[PDB]
């Protein structure tokens, strides 16, 4: 328990032998983590301060370690005055080590008790002491208090100035004394005075260590106090060009990199021109590398736009793009890539091909040696390749051509990286399939005897880029791929990942071939069901490959054959579920695919029923059955769109691509429903103009591209037939069936969240707990919960809200609609609700927890929690009610 543990620690404290006392004291922070109760924390820290006051210096050192480790629990100290009062008493001890530990203690407590003026006085008096340990402890405490108190900072800046300018202060103490000044960012005149002092420091103490420390802390101070940033930048550039020392230049580079990383927008054209002049002028390749890293960092941001045709930056980047050193070349060509993708002037057209051939040279240079630095430069160049092919799409054919011509000769690691780059490029534009597919395939043959380590990953990456390149069916090619896998892989994890990529790119026949091969070699039954279900889904999607335009009987046959294997697969996948990792997204995604294919089958059946069931003698109306079943299909497709929507909303942990894929499923459902409506049900009042800016339809994948193309074709076909015909004509049937067939022809593309869960999160949702309550004494409920996280919390989406919605019902209607949005503030939210149960029956309480992310999107993710509350009146109130009821 809490008290028991504290008592045990106090027993260890009183032990009087130093070993047990130190053991107990250093055992204190683990107790704080175990039981963060403020009464316990306050009493425990009081005991710690008391043993600190009376106890040898090693015990005090252990207490200092505790206070440094338990900085967060200091906020939960109530008796601050007593605690500090007994800590502070040992500053009067004549023992300088005890004074030093006390000063460090006050420095550790600067957060909770700043503006304690006697402590300030102790720092100030101990600053000019004689013992070296006491002076260092005073310096450390001064740093902490200057970080906390504005009054202390302004009081101590003058003392520090006269201490540096003092002559009895040795050089090393001056060195430790300077970076107190980085904490003078509380005030403008304070910062200006500190800046004046630092200028005096660099001019009067020009040693390498002292100029380094002074101009680095001046950089940090100007970084915090934003007014001094431009003069800091110009001072750093001036020191970079003028000061001959390599250490000073290296510091100027590193801290200018810091400034460019935090406030790139404040950089002026003059500063960038000065830095470019420095880079051109220097003969040292390490310095050139450093300031070119600074230039690349600036060029990534908007500073280049502020910088602006030909200029010293452009001359620099062209000159350094072909440098002998690889790092300078990598940074220079990154600068070229950023400038090329930023602006669209007419001189830049000559610059782009310079950049392209620079990237070419980097591929020839960095693709052989296999050094880690070569991997870094190759990654820089390939990321640049991806960037300028995405940003300047008219320049991608040459990019892919040099990637193809180089993929033959590069080493295995370079092959992996170039395959990743090529896969990105191919995903961003589809007009280069069959040719480059054949070249990567003839490359695929020679992968069976490359190496032993990178062979598997190279196979995965090469098969991935093969699938991205491909957009059709392949049989002898799939035979070659399968033969390669059986011959050289014999692993399965490579086969499983390759099959995963095949499912992702929609190549489902060969994915079925691989998944079927993996059933035998798995060991657990859950994974056996999962792999079997993937085999059935892949086979079911390949059943739709045999569709044909304007052949609706074949469409019905193919959809039925697809649905059979889909049903077998969903049964198997539901068998794959387990308490741990329950396949919720996979179950619901496949079930919505089930319902979508069944809706398509029903719609095609009804469209054929237009002629397979002519209307009766009834003199819309006169087509009663076909109109009613059109209406039912409309309701079904709208419900399907709604279910895709709440599946989206329940997918809080999914990546952006999976959410876009689900969004595309929802949009296909909405497209079919709207086509039904505007062709059959309400053509007159659906006078909508499809005036959407389709030019900016940035498709993120070939699958999404086909989705938008088929949406656009169906919508314009519907628009061309708004009011032309009577709403039960065979042309309406042809339009709807062609929409269904075209929608199904583009194969399904499973995504990452289906196969791979990242950024998991959940809510425990504890609350006050067949519960009776007096009707008059309305219920007061406490609801609280913690947000769990798998690895990093904020990977994709950031959570700052919990929109807890709670309702009620009787005879387990909706009497207690109420909600509260609470920021957790420590990954733990807590709030209360008041609930009325004036009805003397039994009320069921349903409490939900939706989440509003940073952008304002609400995700129904939290658990659905239900309890039953019995409501009743006391017998005296019941009795007076009975007497008063008549």
């Amino acid at each position: 328990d809490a008290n028991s543990a504290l008592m045990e620690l106090d027993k260890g404290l009183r032990s009087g032998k130093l070993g047990e006392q130190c053991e107990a004291v250093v055992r204190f922070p683990r107790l704080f983590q175990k039981y963060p109760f403020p009464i316990l924390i306050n009493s425990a820290f009081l005991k710690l301060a008391d043993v600190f006051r009376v106890g040898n210096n090693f015990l005090r050192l252990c207490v200092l370690k505790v206070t440094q480790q338990s900085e967060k629990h200091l906020e939960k100290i109530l008796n601050v005055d007593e605690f500090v009062k007994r800590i502070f008493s040992v500053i009067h001890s004549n023992d300088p080590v005890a004074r030093a530990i006390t000063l460090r203690m006050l420095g550790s407590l600067a957060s909770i008790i700043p503006e304690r003026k006697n402590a300030h006085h102790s720092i100030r008096q101990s600053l000019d002491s004689h013992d070296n340990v006491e002076v260092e402890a005073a310096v450390f405490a001064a740093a902490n208090f200057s970080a906390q108190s504005k009054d202390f900072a302004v009081g101590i800046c003058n003392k520090i100035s006269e201490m540096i300018q003092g002559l009895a202060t040795p050089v090393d103490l001056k060195l430790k004394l300077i970076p107190i000044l980085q904490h003078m960012h509380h005030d403008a005149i304070l910062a200006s005075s500190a800046r004046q002092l630092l200028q005096q420091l660099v001019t009067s103490y020009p040693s390498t260590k002292m100029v380094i420390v002074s101009l680095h802390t001046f950089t940090l101070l100007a970084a915090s106090s934003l007014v001094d940033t431009p003069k800091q930048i110009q001072l750093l550039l001036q020191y970079l060009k003028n000061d001959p020392r390599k250490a000073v230049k290296r510091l100027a580079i590193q801290d200018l990199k810091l400034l460019a990383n935090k406030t790139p927008h404040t950089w002026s054209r003059e500063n960038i021109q000065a830095l470019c002049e420095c880079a051109l002028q220097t003969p040292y390749d390490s310095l050139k590398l450093g300031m070119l890293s600074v230039l690349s960092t600036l060029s990534g941001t908007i500073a280049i736009k502020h910088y602006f045709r030909s200029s010293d930056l452009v001359k620099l980047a062209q000159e350094c793009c072909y440098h002998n050193n690889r790092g300078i070349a990598a940074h220079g060509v990154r600068v070229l890539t950023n400038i090329t993708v930023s602006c669209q002037e007419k001189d830049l057209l000559a610059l782009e091909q310079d950049a392209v051939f620079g990237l070419e040279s980097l591929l020839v240079l960095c693709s052989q040696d296999d050094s880690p630095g070569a991997q870094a430069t190759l990654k820089i160049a390939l990321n640049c390749m991806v960037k300028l092919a995405k940003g300047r799409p008219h320049l991608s054919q040459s990019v892919v051509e040099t990637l193809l011509t180089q993929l033959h000769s590069a080493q295995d690691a370079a092959r992996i990286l170039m395959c990743h780059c090529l896969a990105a490029i191919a995903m961003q534009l589809p007009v280069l399939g069959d040719g480059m597919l054949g070249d990567l395939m003839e490359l695929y043959k020679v992968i069976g005897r490359s190496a032993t380590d990178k062979q598997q990953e190279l196979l995965v990456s090469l098969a991935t880029v093969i699938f991205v390149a491909s957009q059709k069916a392949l049989s002898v090619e799939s035979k070659a791929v399968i033969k390669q896998q059986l011959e050289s892989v014999s692993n399965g994890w490579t086969v499983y990942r390759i099959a995963r990529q095949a499912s992702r790119m929609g190549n489902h026949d060969m994915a079925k071939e691989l998944y079927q091969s993996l059933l035998t070699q798995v060991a657990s039954e859950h994974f056996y069901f999962w792999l079997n279900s993937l085999k059935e889904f892949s086979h079911a999607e390949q059943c739709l490959t045999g569709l044909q335009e304007e052949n609706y009987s074949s469409a019905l046959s193919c959809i039925a054959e697809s649905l059979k294997f889909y049903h077998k697969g969903i049964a198997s996948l539901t068998a794959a579920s387990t308490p741990l990792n329950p396949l919720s997204f996979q179950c619901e995604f496949v079930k919505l695919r089930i319902d979508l294919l069944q809706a398509f089958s029903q719609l095609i059946c009804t469209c054929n029923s237009l002629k397979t069931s002519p209307p009766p003698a009834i003199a819309l109306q006169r087509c009663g059955r076909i109109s009613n079943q059109m209406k039912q299909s409309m309701e079904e497709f709208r419900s399907l769109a709604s279910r895709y929507g709440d599946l989206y909303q329940a997918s809080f942990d999914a990546d952006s691509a999976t959410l876009r894929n689900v969004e595309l499923q929802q949009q296909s459902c909405l497209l079919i429903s709207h086509a039904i409506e505007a062709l059959i049900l309400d053509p007159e009042s659906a006078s909508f103009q499809e005036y959407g800016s389709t030019g900016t339809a940035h498709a993120d994948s070939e699958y999404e591209r086909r989705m938008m193309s088929v949406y656009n074709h169906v919508l314009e076909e519907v628009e061309s037939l708004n009011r032309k015909y009577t709403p039960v004509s065979y042309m309406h049937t042809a339009c709807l069936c062609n929409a269904i067939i075209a929608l199904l022809k583009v194969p399904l593309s499973f995504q990452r969240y289906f196969f791979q869960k990242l950024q998991s999160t959940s809510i425990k949702l504890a609350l006050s707990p067949p519960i009776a309550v007096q009707n008059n004494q309305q219920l007061a409920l406490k609801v609280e919960g913690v947000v769990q996280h798998g690895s990093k919390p904020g990977l994709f989406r950031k959570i700052q809200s919990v929109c807890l919605n709670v309702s009620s019902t009787l005879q387990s209607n909706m009497t207690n609609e109420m909600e509260q949005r609470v920021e957790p503030h420590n990954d733990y939210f807590s709030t209360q609700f008041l609930l009325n149960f004036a009805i003397l029956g039994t009320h069921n309480i349903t409490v939900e927890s939706s989440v509003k992310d940073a952008n304002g999107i609400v995700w129904k993710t939290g658990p659905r929690t239900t309890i039953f509350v019995k409501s009743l009146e006391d017998p005296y109130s019941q009795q007076i009610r009975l007497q008063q009821q008549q």
Partner: peptide
């Protein structure tokens, strides 16, 4: 840090429990 293919499925070296368990059970 720097990545070539921003959307890459093989990026995650240490995977979730499902993929870790599936990997160990098939890397042999």
């Amino acid at each position: 840090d720097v990545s070539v293919w921003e959307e890459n499925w093989e990026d995650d070296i240490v995977q979730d429990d499902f993929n870790q368990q599936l990997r160990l059970e098939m890397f042999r």
